[model samples]
Target: GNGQGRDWKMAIKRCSNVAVGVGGKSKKFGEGNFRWAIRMANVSTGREPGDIPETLDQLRLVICDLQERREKFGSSKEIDMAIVTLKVFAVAGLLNMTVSTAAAAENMYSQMGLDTRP
Candidate 1:
């Protein structure tokens, strides 16, 4: 007993950290993302494109444009598919940039010259 704070900690301890770098974590997170995607899709749009914030003061005008599109299209079964497809292609363009941002952050952390390692 390493005195992990919770019962699930025992099960978690059985897994290697490398599992995340491989398959296990993706499977878990993927399923959760599926549920989250559906939930996010169902949620109503709080704002629309025309209402978008162009000014720094109107920043709160930011909202999920997918929901706005879906609602504007009346959520036909095809609309969800279309919105998902649109979002996929839109973000696909950013995948490399996302990874690059993470790598940049790691580099910046290293350059800070602080030894926070355990």
Candidate 2:
């Protein structure tokens, strides 16, 4: 049971087929991890408490993307990915966050360590 009972695997299967990243540079944020810096840029510009969910939407993309990327790194570990996503929401104003595909992505990225930007 290498990757059994894992949400990340489920998330992967769920996310792998999508063509997200519509129009963002694929540049490295660091350590060869590159994604839409939408959240980061917004953070610098200042997001309202309510607008953070929009940031989380972008966070989701990072999660799904990383989960998809995890396949290349190795078998998916559900908890690890989950933690990465959880942290994103924790910092992005959880109570004020909205639920959607974007929120889901934020959840994923928060679990998978995508929030650890320098």
Candidate 3:
């Protein structure tokens, strides 16, 4: 069996390091921006011609706006779409955690500075 405390910390670090580089992209762009598109799409305003976000707090604002948009739209059955929209507060709560975790991972990579490159 593995040791507990030290092993756990190491595990967390390894996970964070791995998580920061899991998206599809050219490695030449630098590790911190490796998954720029995917991460932005999920946690930022995306590449759309609209207001974007760069922090967890800003990401929260985007979510709030999305929630408002859903509310304003009322209900609609899209072409060939059969799923109903449901805002589960439980899952929404994870948004904070996701944003925070992503921030932490990005920070870790950012700290690598010039050494972040291959």
Candidate 4:
């Protein structure tokens, strides 16, 4: 049997789906991940001790978008297509960022022997 138990595998699948839209096409993203991210962002930004910087807020938005896109499609293929689209955007002078985040991510993928062909 797989190393992960039933519940553990299911939990990771749910998180991967919610985090990157990598699950069943017809299923909406789970609320737990989004709720946690939202809560974390709020608490990190709240007027309390150990307040995190604003970067967490930006990451929260990205997470929300990913989850929404995952739920909006009826086929998991759309997730791959979204990645292709991001590559296009990154190369076409879009996707504003202080540095070349797209290239950095691509480099990381390549370093891990992942095919990033678009």
Candidate 5:
């Protein structure tokens, strides 16, 4: 086996490379414009019409706004449904984007000149 460090080494290159191309890897990092629809929906203000987010910091704002909305409306059971699986990280966290999952996400984001540094 070609043992080095794992897929991240494979992902050292851009998604234009193969190791992180198919298999929904693109979904996790590529074509990220307006992908945060759920968070964007709540952040929509007077002139905040839906638009593109090319950088990671804007993405952070979208998530931040969503967090505020969650706090403002976290009182409702219905609201819980909105982020119970995401921000709360109950079940989908482990299944959807676990430890290694996020690492790959970081790698791909870097390729796009964005960083998800936490």
Candidate 6:
């Protein structure tokens, strides 16, 4: 009963694994409690409405907005980590955005809450 019927746990598992490719909508988004900034990032990044902003300034703002949202999940550890990974995706875009399996790709995909598996 401790871990019964909850999506947060599921998120942790996905994060714990090497799923790769962050952002772009999760079932959790429609579940509610998601902020407006999230949409700006997820959609702006291609295959989505807002895919890849034209300017780094706008991209960083999305990160900042999401950062502001972390506290919203302060009530949850797993959820907090979820926010952490999601934000990192935006941060990566600042570096160059996703495309390959270099450290950038490896770092982003394998790391969550700053954790790298294997």
Please provide, for model 1 over 1-118, each residue's C-alpha lDDT reduced to its tens digit, 9 standing for 90 to 100: 3533332232222221212222334322122332343344434353332331122222112123554565567656443432332222122222211212212322332254311210
**Cα distance off (Å), candidate 4, residue 91:** 20
Local accuracy by lDDT, each model: 0.30, 0.36, 0.29, 0.35, 0.34, 0.38
Clashes per candidate, residues 3 or more apart or on different chains: 0, 14, 0, 0, 0, 9
**Candidate 6: tens digits of C-alpha lDDT, residues 11-105:** 33333332233333333221122223345435433225434343445534544444455445444544333344454334443343432212234
Name the best candidate (by lDDT).
Answer: 6
Q: Please, what is the TM-score per model?
A: 0.24, 0.27, 0.25, 0.21, 0.32, 0.29
Model 5: per-residue Cα lDDT at residue 18: 20
Which one is best on TM-score? Answer: 5
Task: Order the candidates by TM-score, highest first.
Answer: 5, 6, 2, 3, 1, 4
Off by over 4 Å in 6: 1-52, 75-118
Which ranges in model 1 have alpha carbons more than 4 Å from their true place?
1-63, 72-74, 97-118
Better of 3 and 6 by TM-score: 6
**Against the true structure, what is every candidate's RMSD?**
18.7, 15.8, 16.7, 17.5, 12.9, 13.7
lDDT string, candidate 3, 13-104, tens digits = 33233322235322212223323322443332233634323344443344344434444665333300101000111112223222123323
Residue 104 in model 6: shift from native, Å?
5.4
Model 6 residue 91 CA deviation in Å: 7.0
| Cα misplacement distance, residue 115 of candidate 2 (Å) | 15
Clashing pairs in 3: none
Superior candidate under TM-score, 2 versus 3: 2
